[PDB]
């Protein structure tokens, strides 16, 4: 996922998650820095592993 | 987690719990609220670090 512009509004705070919390990175503040590039993983796990 | 930066000299104790998203969170825990005093683990099972 390149050459965007990320809203991250409706994954943080309009959020329906188990979690949102972030490994080195403040996750509360991320808008105000920026990457090369940001990727997206998709698996099927269950709710206990 | 903390609202602002503190002042040179400066300490303050305060047990409240720290919101950040769209919910009041007087006096009990939830989503987008934290407690701020989490302690560390000290082992002898560990290096230099």
Redo the contacts between chains.
Sequence with gaps: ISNCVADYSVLYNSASFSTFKCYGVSPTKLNDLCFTNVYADSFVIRGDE | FRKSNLKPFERDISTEIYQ???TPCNGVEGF?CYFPLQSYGFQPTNGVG
């Design positions: 950040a998203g769209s987008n």
